[PDB]
Design a protein around this nucleic acid. Structure first.
Lengths: 154, 284, 173, 285, 153, 173, 173
RNA sequence: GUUAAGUCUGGUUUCCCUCCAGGGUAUCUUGA
């Protein structure tokens, strides 16, 4: 079945919100939600996407936790309170790209964990730039509302 | 394409005022954020691309990760210096823009106040703006179509109004710049750089040790290489209006506020200007 | 044209016996129309001496003095220590202009020698502390104007505007 | 000849430009630009007419009666205004570009799509029937272009590929230089397939985040932060100014519509926005 | 029937009382003046997210609502707009309760969990097409009431 | 000021030769630069009298005649039925401007008396029938613009700039 | 707090004797703003005895008393036994509020014991016949007040407010 | 008195809209 942008945002934010045990992680995630949606317009989905992947500071226990979050209901993001927020926003964007079927899941989890695939992932993103950029900003606006509603300020 | 990506830094250093700096930095950031990826798998790096330097330089042999994480900071500093020395100012298009616009406004029966101001100390404007934010975390108010940094007209007007209402009362201020129930009587345009001495963008750093720290026990430097605006860069902008009254408080305020700040970090003396020239063309 | 006298308004009061014409001619240019002071004037680059109120030329452009531009001529025991100008009313730097001006004036500013014996260190002097504004109406508006307590019930308005509109820089030395 | 005159013109933004649609709950931006039913920027003819009429009523005070008759009385309306504006449809919008292998270096390029040209052709085809004024030159150029529909092309330069708005890699094909000058400038003009040009254009407007400073703290007020979409400088909007038969219509179209060149559209007039030049197709095509 | 024009009076009375500072009143006026058009144009889930994002739900200010439900001397506490949005959220939830669209017990045990709050939002998402049609006249009544009973700031 | 006489552009033939200085000088208003005819003049309030067409003056602002401006004299056998006058070029209702013409021009206009025996019911007219375009080019343009058929390969541009660009309201009695 | 003698506005001429201090202190509460009489007070459930007007209290909300709340004392002599209060100045229902609420007032009112002689049926008195209105202006609005009929270029424009702001009720005994 | 080696850190946090305008004027049996 096809879930719309707001239903998808609810389903994702529910997985995320229940994985950031530390509350500082929650508030940092909120501050990411509020500004990355505008950064993506101003700079582009691809630059900002890889900027998120870098700020997430992956390649740790912070990666299998992410790939388990796709189906664990117990997976717990861990790391600095600024790394977990970016890793959660990365999960948000990957959840969109996967549920919308824009990109395969296993291809994404492969392009994340090592380098040879990251470049062809860049190429794939440049191919699907209009497919993605058409409608992701509404999903991210939904996430922004959910975040700045369900979380208190820092 | 990734071909456009690998070949971006030579584009920067070989176009130097005719490459779109916004797009150029936004694309350089994909290389910067994927460093350990572009440095693997016998890439299609030419013998002049600025990236195979890091295949030579060896900063750490014990660890493959730490070598890359050090090369990445080296590369960030190198990109700052690249943008700084290559992208310089050609201000003929800005002179054309401002003189054409001045003729336009003379054709609309406005009184114009052309104002040239010169940067004294390395300035920052729009630090939370997005230009280098994906690399440096600290942007610069940039205009991706004039391809030049600028000072927003709203910012100049707001600073001028804060001054005027500091010295003439928040009621004369509202008489000049209007309120939520009336229109303003003065209009400002953005300030674009018209002439530099040698550079436009210059690197800088900010290393907080004890910002939001509890004790000497968690202090740790966190340096922030960003880009600022060179000294001696000259910005000009127009100030037009209809009733000449509002031209009296713009006369005196302007040479007084510029010697204070006009951008960010001015409490540590950064965004300091000086009124290079002023000129009124009355058209009553 | 007509003569015009500039009654500076710092917190001090040294303005009692200075002018040959107190209520002026037919009218002043400064008004009191239940909206506070109108057509109040600003003078930049000069500071006032809190003792023997006099505008001194201190070339710093941040220095300013706001006062009232009244009708009159200063007592003719003077004109050796004042400035006198004919200005076309567009050179004036007014505030809250609620009318029209003769478009060529005769202004009388209480001048001072720049005192080249001690340096000129100025200091911003605002106006607050009602006991200092209580008597501004009792000194420089009941003599300068007659509207004081014949139809004025909005005294609080001009009080608050004096408390906020009029500021200046004084040499404090 | 339903209309006595049909004056199609081009709107050139001298400065950045902001006509607003007001905030809605589905935009991420507080103050967004006006939008077509397709998604492209536009200037509702309400805004066009209001701005132009408010300007004319001050520039030509003695022709005030003619202005009123042709563009509608303000108070006490007793007749239908003779004049007619159509929605200003986006002709071409600047778009910052990166390309390798081009002789001339471009920092930005004009961009349009095929549905926009189809809207222009619809306007021209529709007003040539409702009036005695056909424009067989715009129509010729626009169909010359439109014949190439379904493939990204280029008119005024030789780019074989580029990256528009730092997110969209496009592969172009040059059009023969027999095409006359449309924009009458020195910048190339890409014409993208609409499913791409849609993104490339709606991500080609400037979003300027502004703030509101607290007085005594000299810091940002709370809830004092918002964004605004402007449209780049030198953007071109195509519109038409139709007019029904009368004598005031003649004096309008011969005396007013000539000595008119510069107007102020939109809002934000006091931060240097909104200045616009109207080039008439009849005059300078 | 027109009992929505009466439920509207009930909820508006409760709000009008609970906005003890007149600025909150003058602000809720504008909220009622805007959000009905927003629900007409954009739909219910977009505008509901835009409302809950600016209402600033928290156990403190969400208790000022659960008390407002039953009690009569509750006082909505917060900034002016911060409470002009929570008053409107109260309007909505009050209609959804007094129309049995959702069960008051299921709501109160969800306005507190900090966890089943997302589940409240989802439950609402399932009913969006129904609510979007049911609440129209109720919200138009609230708009008229606010325009009349409250003078412009 | 120089001499620039106004030859109109009808669908008629009786106005083949009406200028005494065909080639004129460099001072020609109406020009052609492969973007087409430029600086076409238009006179509103005047209707053509195609039988030896002299622009009949009426008062209807809706009646216009679009003809071109050419330098020349009225043949010295005239000024008894022309309108000759000196405009500052701030009155030249020029269609398709190309270059900013300086100032202070002197125009010779074909003119007629009202001749009120009849009554004016002027009707719109336009140019078609490409053989008529041939004649209007040969007998008016080429007799003025020998430039065409010298450095031009696209006759179709000027051919189309008479189909659309030129119209008039003839008297039609 | 501060004292308040509320006068009643009758059609009669006895209101001069309730107080000798007709001004009060430094403030008149009911103003003259050239838009009419502002800061007016009206109280419900009351009436006015036609003889020596004093508010006979009843239980009728529709009844009211339309008068002027003067700032100051009832000369310490009158209203020493009548309905007097001290209010937080908000429960003081001022109509056409155009000023600062003093945040507390101690009000004196012309009160009459419930007049237990007859069943008191109300009678609406609607001021007209401007002789009463040309009278009240001289009786109090120059004796009570101090800002009328001195500068007033408009004497009858502020006199016509009484027509449509003070129509009280009576019992006509 | 000498030998050699540098190491660590590499942006965070707030603010994401506030106020007014929410429609006005004109038109409202004829035969049987």
């Amino acid at each position: 079945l096809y879930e719309e942008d707001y239903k998808l945002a609810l389903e994702a934010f529910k997985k995320v919100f229940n994985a950031l045990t530390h509350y500082g992680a929650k508030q940092a995630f909120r501050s990411r939600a509020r500004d990355l949606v505008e950064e993506i317009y101003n700079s582009g989905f691809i630059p900002t996407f890889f900027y998120i992947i870098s700020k997430a500071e992956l390649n740790s226990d912070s990666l299998d936790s992410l790939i388990s979050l796709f189906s664990s209901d117990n997976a717990i993001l861990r790391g600095s309170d600024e790394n977990v927020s970016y890793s959660a926003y990365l999960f948000i964007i990957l959840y969109y790209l996967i549920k919308r079927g824009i990109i395969e899941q296993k291809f994404l989890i492969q392009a994340l964990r090592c380098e040879k695939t990251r470049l062809d992932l860049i190429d794939k993103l440049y191919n699907l730039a209009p497919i993605i950029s058409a409608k992701i900003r509404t999903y991210l606006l939904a996430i922004k509302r959910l975040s700045e509603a369900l979380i208190e300020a820092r | 394409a990734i071909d456009f990506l690998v070949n971006i830094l030579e584009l920067i250093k070989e176009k130097q005022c005719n490459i779109n700096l916004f797009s150029a930095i936004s694309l350089t950031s994909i290389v910067y954020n994927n460093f350990g990826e572009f440095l693997s798998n016998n890439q299609s790096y030419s013998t002049n691309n600025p990236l195979l330097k890091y295949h030579i330089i060896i900063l750490n042999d014990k660890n493959k990760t730490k070598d890359v994480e050090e090369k990445r900071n080296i590369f960030k500093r190198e990109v700052a210096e690249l943008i700084s020395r290559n992208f310089k100012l050609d201000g003929e298009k800005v002179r054309n823009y401002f003189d054409s616009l001045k003729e336009v406004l003379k054709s609309l029966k406005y009184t114009i106040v052309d104002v040239e101001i010169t940067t004294r100390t390395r300035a920052l404007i729009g630090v939370s703006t997005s230009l280098g934010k994906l690399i440096f975390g600290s942007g610069i108010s940039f205009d991706p179509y004039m391809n030049l940094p600028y000072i927003p007209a709203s910012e100049i007007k707001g600073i001028v109004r804060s001054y005027i209402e500091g010295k003439l009362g928040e009621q004369e201020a509202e008489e000049i710049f209007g309120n939520e129930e009336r229109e303003g009587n003065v209009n400002f345009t953005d300030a674009y750089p018209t002439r530099s001495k040698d550079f436009l963008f210059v690197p800088d750093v900010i290393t907080p040790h004890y910002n939001g720290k509890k004790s000497e026990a968690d202090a740790e430097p966190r340096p922030v290489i960003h880009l600022t605006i060179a000294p001696k860069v000259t910005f000009r902008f127009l100030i037009y209006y209809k009733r000449e009254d509002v031209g009296k408080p713009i006369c005196d305020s302007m040479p007084i506020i510029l010697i204070r700040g006009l951008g960010a970090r001015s409490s540590v003396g950064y965004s300091l200007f000086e009124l290079r020239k002023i000129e009124v063309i009355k058209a009553a | 044209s007509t003569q015009r006298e500039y009654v500076f308004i710092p917190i001090t009061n040294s303005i009692t016996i200075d002018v040959k014409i107190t209520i002026g001619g037919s009218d002043h240019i400064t008004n009191i129309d239940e909206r506070g002071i109108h057509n109040v004037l600003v003078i930049t680059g000069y500071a006032v001496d809190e003792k023997n109120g006099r505008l001194v030329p201190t070339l710093d452009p941040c220095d300013y003095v706001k006062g009232i531009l009244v009708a009159g001529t200063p007592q003719q025991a003077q004109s050796n220590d004042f400035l006198t100008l004919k200005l076309p009313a567009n050179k004036l730097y007014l505030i809250r202009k609620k009318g029209n001006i003769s478009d060529d004036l005769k202004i009388y500013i209480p001048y001072s020698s720049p005192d080249a014996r001690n340096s000129m260190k100025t200091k911003p002097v605002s106006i607050s502390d009602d006991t200092i504004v209580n008597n501004i109406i009792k000194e420089v508006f009941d003599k300068i104007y007659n509207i004081t307590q014949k139809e004025k019930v909005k005294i609080e308005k001009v009080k608050e505007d004096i408390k906020e509109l009029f500021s200046y820089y004084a040499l404090e030395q | 000849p339903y209309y006595a005159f049909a004056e199609p013109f081009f709107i050139h933004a001298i400065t950045h430009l902001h006509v607003g649609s007001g905030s809605s709950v589905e935009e991420e931006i507080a103050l967004p630009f006006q939008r077509d039913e397709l998604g492209y920027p536009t200037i509702y003819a309400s805004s066009l007419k209001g701005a132009i009429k408010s300007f004319l009523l001050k520039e030509f005070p003695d022709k005030r009666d003619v202005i009123y008759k042709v563009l509608g009385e303000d108070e006490n309306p007793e007749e239908a205004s003779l004049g007619t504006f159509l929605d200003a449809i986006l002709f071409a919008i600047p778009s910052r570009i990166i390309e390798i292998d081009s002789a001339k270096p471009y920092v930005w390029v004009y961009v349009t799509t095929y549905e926009l040209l189809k809207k222009v052709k619809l306007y021209l085809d529709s007003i040539s029937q409702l009036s005695n004024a056909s424009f067989s030159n715009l129509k010729n150029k626009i169909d010359t272009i439109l014949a190439k529909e379904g493939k990204n092309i280029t008119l005024d330069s030789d780019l074989k590929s580029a990256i528009l708005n730092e997110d969209f890699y496009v592969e172009l094909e040059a059009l023969n230089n027999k095409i006359p000058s449309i924009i009458n400038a020195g910048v190339p003009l890409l014409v993208l397939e609409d499913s791409i040009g849609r993104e490339v254009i709606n991500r080609s407007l400037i979003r300027v985040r502004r703030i509101r400073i607290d007085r005594d703290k000299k810091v940002v007020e709370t809830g004092g932060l918002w964004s605004e979409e402007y449209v780049p400088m030198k953007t071109i909007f195509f519109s038409v100014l139709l007019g029904k038969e009368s004598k005031e219509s003649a004096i309008f179209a011969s005396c007013i519509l000539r000595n008119l060149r510069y107007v102020i559209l939109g809002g934000k007039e006091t931060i240097g926005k909104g200045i616009v030049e109207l080039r008439w197709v009849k005059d300078v095509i």
